[model samples]
Target chain A: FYKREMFDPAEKYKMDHRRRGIALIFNHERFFWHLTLPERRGTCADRDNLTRRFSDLGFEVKCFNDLKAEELLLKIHEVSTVSHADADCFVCVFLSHGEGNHIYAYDAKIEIQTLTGLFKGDKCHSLVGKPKIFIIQAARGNQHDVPVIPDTNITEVDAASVYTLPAGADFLMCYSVAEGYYSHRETVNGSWYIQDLCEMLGKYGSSLEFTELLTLVNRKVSQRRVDFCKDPSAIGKKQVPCFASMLTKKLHFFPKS
Target chain B: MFDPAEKYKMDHRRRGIALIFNHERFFWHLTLPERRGTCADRDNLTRRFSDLGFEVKCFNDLKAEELLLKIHEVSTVSHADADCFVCVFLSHGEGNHIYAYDAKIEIQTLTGLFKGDKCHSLVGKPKIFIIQAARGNQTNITEVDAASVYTLPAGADFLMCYSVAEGYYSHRETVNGSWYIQDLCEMLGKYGSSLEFTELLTLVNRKVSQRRVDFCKDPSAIGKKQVPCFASMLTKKLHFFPK
Candidate 1:
């Protein structure tokens, strides 16, 4: 006997909550002197761009700029403690200088797990089965390549590992570049990944499935080149964004009625 | 606007090739133990995938160079009309490397052949790789028997399913094959056409994790557990709906 056809909508995550949930932006531009990390120029543009885009998608957007390690942990933990019964899903973005599995705060670096672990099923009951999307724009390593011959006026700089997915279901980790590759940033236009990501979100956040939209972002970002850079090793190099997904159901951001 | 319910286009001319690199024995000098039950796993997978319409090809105990040559040959051939590509490795492994008959090869070198840039015909099509191998040398024993772990263009539209998590032991039975391949094949047979691919994998994860090795005489080996996990970059719903 033929199996009964399953309902199509049942396969998708419920996105009709009263609220679209909290979107936290941890935008780090400058680090403490002892850290000696170069300032992440043009990150403000990314922050503002994301705030506007996420706000448009019905999220209660909150921006935290230059939080120290302790303060960063406190703020995120505070958010994780709150109930999300009325919300759809959670979104967190990191724009900073990072290496390997850690991202920099003003005073020091924090392990990515230390921040993401707070929202696992055991720790954050309200978000146990809901989507928790993380968009990270940072350097994962210090590898350099020859700079591209000047095609445009934009300057390219090396940004830094591998950021593996945290253990759990319903989590998505989007990284600016693949593991062991440098993430590139223009002095003026912001990060290559975030720029394309925000563009895709603004265009499709209300209609497209989230992962499908990310694929477009991946294509757009990978097609970009360094265009112009002084460092010889950075010449003509390209960056490809990667996402590790554990989402079981289709995720969408259709506007709440 | 795009369809939220969009799925990977699986209606190509054919279901494509499923390559199985089964390594049951290693070089004597390498000191890697013979994987006794792997032939059963190889046969199990070959039948399951063949039923799913794949042109399943199994290569047993190829030297490292020969294994690379075979895979490289497959990767370079045009897959323009095919639906997707699949590769299975059954061997002893550590860290990110898998063994051939005589040497261990980095996983990247094998997978890199089918990237978007290198394998243009298969670009945007699903390239699924299932690996059944141990990631470390650690094994628990009381008295009884035993068993055996990403960049783009070289990144997207691929699924990497591991038999065990990193730094953990993978269980196998000389008669029944591996806990992972057996349960995986069972699930594929039961729901291969009906369930979303990732959703089916979640079922495999549940089946594999809930199992405990109860018959082993070694106290440490008895009741030992394993949890299979997958890293997915698939951008759309994947269903092996009969083509």
Candidate 2:
């Protein structure tokens, strides 16, 4: 049979009617110890705003407090495997002190990679062809505890083929700070990264992509603090959220349907 | 190098349309064949829009640095000082973002480059983006039958047209055109000026929906199902210019 002149989008999209979203926000409110580094705040505030934001954006936003890793994973399994309800996307926002690719839960510490990796490309075909938004506010490393002496020479790594993923999946990991550093937060407001993130998003979420919204956060994170703010060793670091995409199209916040 | 996309003037009380094209491959492997699908989509959009008497300029296949330069180039090249700006991209994406050149260079980096304070020329003008990037991993593809093809307001004069939604496949015909572009062109041709942007896009949506519906039934599938998303932040009273 010959092909039709045009292809159908609903079939192509497998249009799952409900824009159900489950946002898991983790804030170890007690992780604030004597460490001179900035403490985590506004997690609950962030979660509150996020739930409303997600709900407003056509998602049935689900929030969890003090969830452990196992519990978090269980939640993923529970939500992802449910066939009766068509889940369009899944999101997890971690607000904790992190060093590896892991974020701490209020009740138990969970590896961010482990949690995300559990949801693979093939296993969950229900959300296939749909965008899974992951916004992580954790530090990768703290080797450069002080301000990074500016590195002017940018790396010229431009091979798209090398960077393109053949199978893994499409995603954007938003970090509170670039690898090998600590993220900054005001005594009251919150981490410089997330605060700026929410603020910019509050202003531009309607027309901007999540990352575009984050770049503004990145700029302010690096520029907002210094080592002398609290401790002599505590230098302000910029939060550079990198994008590792296997995606094929640009994403818009309120993208025209 | 800079991607050359310019806009023309509207009537005496008229203003020119804004054209913004984002190409995230300046530092890419030239060894790879040209991204014909996106390249054609952008240029064709420009040519078609320009033919309708709006100013046009599409920037693709460039780095973040190149995008910065093109903004300057277009501003200097304009004769009518267009009243709107449209942005188009051919790149990779994260959740709600698209890659500029490398994974390190971001979609926001370029967009923020055109702020109300920075590119005052574009401030309050319709700054649109015809973005082509996947927001997430595609796993869900479904089909629903409908009998109509149509138009609607995206709620923003500065609207965004996506190739695919958050986590879905954006069909590329390889030799023909990307699914979104093909449907858009087809709709524009058949409907003429009667259909508006979102109205024209519904046809694009339905067509993409149909592709997923047809492709999902086959046992030999390679990719995930696809859907598109739209985000608009526009003032309430602005009316669209004639198609």
Candidate 3:
């Protein structure tokens, strides 16, 4: 019996496809009256920013506004079922009000998993092993992340044929805030997370490793404080973005030459 | 504004300390089973990390209090001249807690001590934790069975690596050690000084996932599987290139 221990020296994802793939933007603004969700102002700005940025990255950018839950799922499912053989990767962005594990559509709330599960390797075979990135800008809870002051204290599958990839593999979930923390969005400028993310992407998207770029995003967002909030609880609060990555290689969005 | 191209400086005076907490036998009251072959994992990691230029320290069977105290002490020490910090845990764990000899400790409490606010000298530097533990107790006996498996400020340059995903069992060979640690050690030995750290981890992920429990006598576990994962908040590419 022979041990399987071959290592690929070039440990980077191939980004030389003819196309950079689709960048889907689900921008939610108005909510049905009964849903009692506040209208998300400035989301249009986020949409515009992402459309421009992703378009520059060579993605075929598409934006949808105020899609009902059913329509949203249908559109995303349609995208997931398309062939990505000529594309390098996939990206989807959500800008809306969310709590815990769900995000709001125009008329109803959609389980985030229901949206993401469609792109899993088992379901979206065309995109398997390619980067499937989801960037969510929503509040996970009502809790604000209080600023902490600095303290002086110094203080698998051996056989290739039998190998089955985990459903969560090769995906990256970028959250605007950590769990149980409120996400901040300005009425005119859009979100703290997305603002920094776009700025960094525009500056370094084609050159830097994605996670390293995200760390810069995290740092930029974390350093922001809610100085203009009228509510006492919201003032001076901090926000930190988090990303859960199951990506198996370095992710860089080098321009398709 | 931070430069997007900046990398964590790894040219410090030392490669920093690697703390290995190997929990083999637990106190009977905790009802945790003995983690057979963890010592082998501890030894393997110690040697591999030492070769990577770390000052490796191995601890065995520490009670919860002792574990916390040791880690807290390490956190308080100045790491001004070190590249980064590494911690390894080999034990029984569930949800968000890992077992010590006598009690289950919240993984956060251990990690929180080293946040940027608490550990100033290590801010903007990588603090990597490598864990090898079962998230649950049930083995997948096919008769049938199954299994499952950061902050700078007191929240940014941390990487948490888990042997198995949430709600899954982590596997270990009584003589060979854990599947995750074994593969991780091998990858580090081969690529530690050359490859980007996360890239090496992805290789470990590939290696461990390809392995199956082919030798287990329990029918339920004979074909069991696992997939290792990591959550990275590292701000830069990490490489241990013989510094």
Candidate 4:
């Protein structure tokens, strides 16, 4: 047996987590029209879904739209420094076009680590041992080829390890697609990852474990093949979600009536 | 305060039977290490189930043949006076098979021994299978219905809660035991008497979701995750205790 039990959170924290926490969402919908990057046409749906879902989980949800890189960083630092003495966790979401390890805001690409570093144990003292989660929905790359299934409607690819978290940090980062690939977003249903994620959490959040719920989200999203580029070759592509976590306890949202 | 759903409650008027199969060590693979910290899991379960009004029968480190014989023996008895039949399997497993000390048995086949057809007494009563899988990574097809076909009929009261989804490995701590069993016991102890079975399970899912098992010590196995899964063939409400 190992000498340490990193995953054990006090039971009191789990049960007492009702109506306590901060969840911030940075939804980057439009880049500079000058950058020749097409506007993310179907992101409002992702925003609505996230806001509703976070509220259901008892977090005070806030959505920040079209932030420049500087603004995004300042907001994170501001949120991190506040007194979360009564809260149990913190969550931040970034939805934009991703390149390598950076997320694009309105003007420039922001290194993900720059934003996450604000909430490190030393920086975010009020939430040292508590859980912190990041939900990132963005394209990992321009184009990648993989095995295709026409009838299943969703493309199936062997997704590589998607994101990297500091080995021992208490953070859970959920990526929409595996590395070196494009994620799918439909004009009508929003991004496949966020839509399936919210749907599953809405229906099963009360009962399913977060990891279990996420696995089901992977199944539901990967099965829905979509054409994000509107190119014929891009049809029937699948997106696999990948998550990395250093969380040490089982988190639950059991409503006390 | 009132819970109207309690009207459909099981005959907690009588004690339920809980069978716990604890496989702390395995055979044939001498180099394979024993399941450390499972004795605590089994003991914790025995104490909890007994507290929740169950007559618990526990088996430790049985081979496949021994496991099969015991299931057959349990199926022969009438659960006429019982409210539900509960079984917990803690061992190594593949997609749908649970391993004893040396051999493996198909999980559905084992449960079939007490199906509505095979075991008359347990026909309508809930047959709950709580599995704590060790290194089982077969593509999981859940217990109730896999791709819309029958594992058992939908009308029968059967529920199987596996430690991880098909094709995923469950996390086990050296000191705390498997994540699924630990959370399952915690939730059951807290709400087993107050809520319906399905309602309690949702809370269990949420609790377990919050746990992450990152094998940082092994680079090859690092960054992997496990999620627990459960399926049901319940046609009616079943609560463990009545207020």
Candidate 5:
């Protein structure tokens, strides 16, 4: 069922060898307090899709499952200090249940910031001049479902870009939802953020850079008017993705020939 | 005359740290086309923050690791004296990572260091990040050679303002600096004295959105536009100037 021809060689050659980057993904499914937190379903789909997408993009993709918060922290520290001279950039992904600014392990609560700070420009010298991206697919909180009407008259919005300064930069981060808002996921399809994010990347990966693709991701997720609860009380809800960056120049996932 | 304080009380807490990092070159010895306009940006931002009563620190041409260390060092110090914090980055970038003079670092990595639990002094305080990217904006990107996308950390009391939206290019002049930063300085100087953080950003948004952006030399990229985007998780109103 695998199709290698769907892949492009010109794509591989550009990010090959030292130009290629490494991707680290941590997907958490089970929770220690099963009584309070429900198990995450459809994560297999997210992990599979992300692994393939990133690998195809010339990344050395590594996936870890059901890690405790401490273990996750340890791994990040270890990964950060390792020599990445052979790689051009790095990627880290966390798929878990979360509240506030913290992600949960099957055992403990991990401050998301603590785990990522290990790769700061000061801590990880090996990746001193390289890109390190962190993706969090976690809910910030719960939002009450709202009522929605079908949209038939809306038109697409315009996309734009700008060129800016040079003050030692390059960093981008995306969250499943805006803060103080809940990120939606179904037991069947996975988190809304990942589904839309990967889908957009798959469709636009060949034509758009990360920023453009991410913009599409934002638009796609924001446009959906899904009902989190269709039964009694029926709650309708929507989610928006957010990002932060300090990049000096524009970034493209795939460069033009 | 209308007194702004009738609806909002002045926040007389200690003014916070305004950190700025500037990177001008790359690891491969590739020098960026000179960013002469940034000098004005640096000086202007410093003056504005000081005028609004902020303790500012500036770092230049740090490598990726050095930037991290600098942020951590600052984060470790007690911030109980300050009401809020701000950090700015200027560099060449792709999408998610900012380059240190010789390498790149993540914005979340820097901001995360100041999160409530990590930097206890800043718990429940507003932490803001402003980024002016040098590149990474492209209308059409072929995946043949590209960097992967990354994630932003979610938290309470945090704000991030990006000069351009995702995947769009940003503009800068050799003498005037970036349209985003230059415009940012002008707007803050104009409205910051009276507006709350969110309101100030709203005005910044409108000003940025109303402009027409184009490039004469790069015809393929001409007619393109730029807009400011913000991500916030503040629990309370943040006012830079209190009268």
Candidate 6:
């Protein structure tokens, strides 16, 4: 019998104040010369271009080549804490070899949480009401075999609930491979997925709908197959990127001012 | 075109069931007079759907009774009595529920009133409730180093799509984000008829998922996650079938 009828004059004062933007994080450690080297053996056009493309869309893009885990954490904290200023939203893209929910640090591989899982809906409140994105270009694992008798050698962790948040922030993680599979790459650029993704963003900067752009990425990556990216001579392999998002609204990266 | 659903009193069995009942009132939570983006967001969304064919029934400054009345009245109009119903509630709310300016009523209680047994006019048809609201604090969870696209519910329909998520941040135009309506329009305008309602929802999810910074969680989670709940007793599948 409780009917919520009658409007409350007090309810008219509530307001929603938040803007929107994007953030980009690039990890280029695997491309380094030595296994434990601190120097960049070579420059990656794909990573550089991806940063520029995101920046062009008015994003506060950050690029780190040889960062250790703490240093990487510092930049993340700075942005999240508004060490600079507040942005409408954020995006971070990680390029490295990963296992399960762990991301590798440039200085040395470290044990850390997944780049995206760290920002849960309830964990990051400042961003709780906003959009948080991570485009990860890495493999979940580097293993191959026949389906095995269902295999028992590997220990698995429940990645879904792997990390907690500081409350209010949201997260979206776009991955580069299927679980239990090895993602392919291109020696010249980067992963075929990231290269095509960056290229797609550059070409159709602000025109295509967000979904259309992904569809484009899916199509382009699908057609451009990879070859032997392995140690020496495994016939070139093809890679397809996958996305697992936990978003709740309809959003566009760059909205006209 | 202007309120045709209400103007024509065709028989319940013969008339069409079309009503876009939408409400946006975000400024209702604060004391400051000028911070209400929810209303504008709601309005923009209503306009977007209106352009796509809905009869757009708007109710501003309404309490819980008014909201229910508006939807109920809209439902009554179709010849089939409680036939196909599509209601979108836009406001600032806590998790699993919504708000009505001066009316204090749980969102589920009100939404449940339209159940098939209670409202036979729309029996066996899809009764969709598209809500644009909030659940908790708007904070950034990912440290700058780990920023990535993170939230999206992996389940069935009854999608409770939040502009942001449960406790994460949801960005409004600082005049930051013009409004998700801009993006919603761009996507729906192109794929409305070609994709299933769920397909469009996922497409909307991805559009919002991409291109957002840590703070730009509009229509979903500023930082949290969302799941639009739809307890459907729908008999036939919804085929927004291709042309």
Top lDDT model: 1
Ranking the candidates on DockQ from highest down gives 3, 1, 5, 6, 2, 4
Top DockQ model: 3
Candidate 4 lDDT by residue in tens digits, A129-193: 77788888876423342233221233322222233222224566677765433477765557888
The TM-score leader among the candidates is: 3
True contacts kept of 6: 0.04
Q: By lDDT, is 2 or 3 better?
A: 3
- Put down candidate 4 lDDT per residue, B15-94, tens digits, no spaces: 67899999878785633456776777898899888988888999999878888999899889878888888899887665
Off by over 4 Å in 2: A1-25, A28-37, A45-63, A66-71, A82-257, B1-29, B35-44, B47-53, B57-71, B76-81, B89-113, B131-171, B186-210, B213-243
TM-score of 5: 0.48
Docking class of 6: incorrect
Better of 1 and 5 by DockQ: 1
> Each prediction's Cα lDDT score?
0.77, 0.47, 0.75, 0.66, 0.61, 0.46
Q: Write the per-residue lDDT of candidate 2 for residues B196-224, one digit (tens) a residue.
A: 34434545655564554344443444445
**Whole-structure CA lDDT of model 5:** 0.61
On lDDT, the stronger of 1 and 6 is 1
Alpha-carbon runs more than 4 Å astray in model 1: A1-10, A14-19, A85-87, A140-160, A180-182, A225-236, B1-14, B24-37, B76-83, B116-125, B136-158, B164-243
Kindly report, for each predicted structure in the order presented, the TM-score of its chain A compared with the true chain A.
Answer: 0.88, 0.69, 0.84, 0.82, 0.76, 0.67
- Kindly state the fnat score of candidate 1: 0.08
Query: What local lDDT score does residue A75 receive in model 4, on the 0 to 100 scale?
Result: 83
DockQ for each candidate?
A: 0.24, 0.04, 0.29, 0.03, 0.05, 0.04
Candidate 5 residue lDDT tens string, A1-257: 38555312112122333556779989887766532555567676788889988877777888989987778788778888888877767888878767645677777778766765677556777665455667778653222222222112111111111111111134446666663234666566666778887876676665554544655565566556654354322133345566554433334466322
Ten-residue stretch with the least lDDT total in model 5 chain B: B140-149
Better of 5 and 6 by lDDT: 5
Candidate 3 interface RMS = 6.9
TM-score of each: 0.77, 0.49, 0.83, 0.47, 0.48, 0.44
True lDDT of residue A101, candidate 1:
69
Clashing residue pairs in all predictions, respectively, total 18, 74, 30, 10, 68, 137
